[PDB]
Amino acid sequence: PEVRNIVDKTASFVARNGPEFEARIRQNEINNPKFNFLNPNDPYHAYYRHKVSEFKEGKAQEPSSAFDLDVVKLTAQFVARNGRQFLTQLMQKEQRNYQFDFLRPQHSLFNYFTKLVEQYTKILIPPKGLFSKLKKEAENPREVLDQVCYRVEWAKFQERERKKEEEEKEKERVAYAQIDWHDFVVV
């Protein structure tokens, strides 16, 4: 396919370098119809100038309570010492001839139990009161100023996050409230 390969070739050269090189090369070889496909003179005019667009854009191919709180405290004491996912000190308490009413996850008290477990963990981390205790808190107002400023910087980033989320949601709601409401159709 000679004319096809010519249109596809000019298409690659015009997908790379363009109609400016078309004008250049046509002024350089407009004596012969080898550039008549890049000029008005051949039938490959339309196919050529379109195949340039195709191979450029990506369409064409290369040419080829105290009690309940205590019970929750005991739940935290058991979750601090539960050393395996299936072995602990509360597996026995669940079905061991007593009531176990904080053992539910579908209870809302499961969330307070998870908070109490987070507190027991904050006491069980070695830097949290096991065998090492750092005094940059007990005698540290400078690290305390650093921490205040760190909380404040997290707060600034979070205020920005809330503002951006509110704006994005409002724009998306306006877009749904202006989305296509007439040309409903299926394929």
Binding site: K171, E172, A175, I179, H182, F184
Partner: peptide, 13 residues
């Protein structure tokens, strides 16, 4: 930044 918005409605418009 617009994501697609969907809705199911009646065929009266």
């Amino acid at each position: 930044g617009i994501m697609p918005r969907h809705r199911f409605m009646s065929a009266y418009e």
